[PDB]
Every structure is written in structure tokens, then in C-alpha cells.
Design a protein around this ligand. Structure first.
Ligand SMILES: COc1ccc(C(=O)NCC(N)=O)cc1
Ligand SMILES: [Cl-]
Ligand SMILES: [Cl-]
Ligand SMILES: [Cl-]
Ligand SMILES: [Cl-]
Ligand SMILES: [Mn+2]
Length: 340
């Protein structure tokens, strides 16, 4: 029946069911003040779906010059046309190929660039901003968003939103690699999955997705969203509490040294954004440091709320279009303060 909310991660993650429900703040407040991430489903049903297709991005902006990253080896592909990315989004045989002759898993880097989203795409901006959940926290002029209200003693976020576009990771070896490596942000963020592209040509890649989710350490209720409701899964997230950041640094310093890296003892492997925590490193983090995270599968229309200071990483299961907005909640303002 109509339910206001449910729990995922064996009770540890709030999942709100109606993104426009004026009472969401009452349940959200409590979980958010404890430094938890939150998931809101059903945002895709609020959007104009014709504005968020790969084909329309290709047609309208195809001639713009961009760089891409090879997600498998971190190689940068320099000064190509953005249509070279979009036209292989879903059709595998159209994708740029590596020396080995295999179609590459690519991320479109920094597009639209800097703070240009609103200028380049005024109709998309309107469609997203008008349908963000928890609007008092997430809108530019929201009463509980301090972004526009803080003095220079605070690190203020850029004007957004930002778009995150990348292919899905495919093989058994791709399971140990990230779309976005482990990092943290000094402000809060909401990340919405506006489109999930399920590719064709090698269109029998269903079972590898399920083994990645399973090995990802995803909860039984999350697996029921696929098998029962036939929802489209986009990305596997791992998020850790802000207060566990330094323990994670201690693990990654030790593993670095083990792997022959020669780093100063105070260097910051989270700020380096060079690590993905695979099943081996997540197990080790649990056993040797007593740190546990949230394994979150972001489906089409799912909004992921990321607390300020929380280390997080992303692994695309299929090809994803994501749009993210920064904000500064009073709950977490400490994380962007320039003193002590
Ligand atoms: C910050 O400490 C914790 C401790 C435990 C969890 C948890 O139950 N995770 C389950 C899952 N499937 O991801 C989340 C956070
Ligand atoms: Cl906090
Ligand atoms: Cl537009
Ligand atoms: Cl609100
Ligand atoms: Cl990255
Ligand atoms: Mn981020």
C-alpha cells in the first residue's frame, strides 16, 4: 500500500517513498542529525523524461570538445567531440577501442564544465531544481540551506548542479575498479539518477550485475527491488560516517606502504582520490579497524543524500546520467569551518 517510508541496509538507511511529501522533513531530520545518508525514490516520475535521454544530449551539444577517462586504467583521452561519448552510451560496438581492441568503459570528465550547467541547459536546470526532495535543505534559497548565508570563515560550495555521465563496468576484473574513487566533500549533496541505459550488442550482461551487487555486500530487501519490482539498477555506492574518515586513512596508508608506495606519514589518501575499496579492502576495514559502511544501490529516480565529511565511492552497474546539487545544512556546517 501507500507507505511514507521503509528501511534498507538491515534498518540502517531511511528510504522515503514520495519525493514531494511536505512531511518528509519530520523523518529525515532525525536520521540526518546522526550523520546517516538517506535515499528518496520516485524522482524520475516527477521529471520530463524527454529532457534526460542520451540521444538528445548528442543532437544538441555533440560538437563541443571534451576529455574522457578510461575507467579501467585511468588514462585520459584528450580533446574529442562529446558525441563520441554519447553515441556509444548504450550501443557497445560504437564505443572507442583500447590497443587490446576491446570497447573502453568511459567517463565524460567535467561536462557541462565548471558552473556552466544553468547557462548551457536552462530548461534541464528548471526541471531538476523544481523537483528536488527536501526543498528547504536542497534549493538555493531554502530556509535550511546556509550556502548563501555564511561568511568567508566557511568553505562555500560552487553554484550547481553538476552532471556525472559514465558507462557501466562490465567484467569480473571491472569489479575491483570505481567510476568515482573514494573521496569526501566539505558540504552536503543530493545526487539524482535521471537516466539508466541498459546496453545492447553484448546484451546478456544481466548475471554479472547481480554478482557485483551480491559481492558489493548489498542487503536482501535491496535485491528484492530487482527480482520483484523489475526496477533499473544504476550504480553501487559505499558511504562511510564522517567520524570514521581517519581510520580509513590509516588502512590506506598501511596498504600503500605494503604495495611499495613511498608516501610521507601525514599524506591524505582520501584527498588523493586514488583508491577504490574492493571486497578485500572493505572486509579488512571491518576486521582490522571495526569500521562498517552503507552499501547503497541507486536505481532510476533514486536521490542519494551524502552527509558533509562522509567518505564515498561509486561503481556504475549500467550506463548512468546523474545530476548532483551541493547545500549546507545547519546539522553539518562544522565540516566546512576554516578554524580549529
Ligand atoms: C556507520 O556505521 C554503520 C554500521 C552498519 C551499517 C549497516 O548496517 N550496513 C548494512 C549494508 N547493507 O550496507 C551502516 C553504518
Ligand atoms: Cl557530522
Ligand atoms: Cl535545456
Ligand atoms: Cl524540506
Ligand atoms: Cl575518481
Ligand atoms: Mn563527490
Amino acid at each position: 500500500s501507500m507507505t511514507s517510508h521503509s528501511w534498507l541496509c538491515d534498518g540502517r538507511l531511511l528510504c522515503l517513498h514520495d519525493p514531494s511529501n511536505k512531511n518528509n522533513w519530520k523523518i529525515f531530520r532525525e536520521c540526518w542529525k546522526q550523520g546517516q545518508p538517506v535515499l528518496v525514490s520516485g524522482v524520475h516520475k516527477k521529471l520530463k523524461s524527454e529532457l534526460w535521454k542520451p540521444e538528445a544530449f548528442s543532437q544538441e551539444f555533440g560538437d563541443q570538445d571534451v576529455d574522457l577517462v578510461n575507467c579501467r586504467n585511468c588514462a585520459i583521452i584528450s580533446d574529442v567531440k562529446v558525441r563520441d561519448f554519447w553515441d556509444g552510451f548504450e550501443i557497445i560496438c560504437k564505443r572507442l577501442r583500447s590497443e587490446d581492441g576491446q570497447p573502453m568503459v568511459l567517463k565524460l570528465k567535467d561536462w557541462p564544465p565548471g558552473e556552466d550547467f544553468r547557462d548551457m541547459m536552462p530548461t534541464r536546470f528548471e526541471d531538476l531544481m523544481e523537483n528536488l526532495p527536501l526543498p528547504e535543505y536542497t534549493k538555493r534559497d531554502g530556509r535550511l540551506n546556509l550556502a548563501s548565508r555564511l561568511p568567508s570563515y566557511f568553505v562555500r560550495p560552487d553554484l550547481g548542479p553538476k552532471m556525472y555521465n559514465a558507462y557501466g563496468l562490465i567484467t569480473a576484473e571491472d569489479r575491483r575498479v570505481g567510476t568515482t574513487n573514494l573521496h569526501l566533500d566539505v558540504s552536503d549533496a543530493v545526487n539524482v539518477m535521471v537516466y539508466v541505459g541498459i546496453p545492447i550488442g553484448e546484451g546478456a550482461h544481466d548475471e554479472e550485475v547481480l554478482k557485483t551487487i551480491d559481492e558489493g555486500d548489498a542487503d536482501e530487501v535491496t535485491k528484492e527491488r530487482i527480482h520483484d519490482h523489475k526496477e533499473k539498477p544504476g550504480a553501487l555506492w559505499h558511504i562511510y560516517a564522517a567520524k570514521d574518515a581517519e581510520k580509513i586513512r590509516e588502512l590506506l596508508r598501511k596498504v600503500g606502504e605494503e604495495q611499495g608506495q613511498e608516501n610521507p606519514p601525514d599524506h591524505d589518501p582520501i584527498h588523493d582520490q586514488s583508491w577504490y575499496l574492493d571486497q578485500t579492502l572493505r572486509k579488512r576495514l571491518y576486521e582490522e579497524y571495526g569500521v562498517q559502511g552503507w552499501a547503497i544501490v541507486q536505481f532510476l529516480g533514486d536521490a542519494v543524500f551524502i552527509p558533509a565529511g562522509a567518505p564515498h565511492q561509486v561503481h556504475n552497474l549500467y550506463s548512468c546520467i546523474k545530476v548532483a546539487e551541493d547545500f549546507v545544512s545547519p546539522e553539518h556546517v562544522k565540516h566546512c569551518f576554516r578554524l580549529t
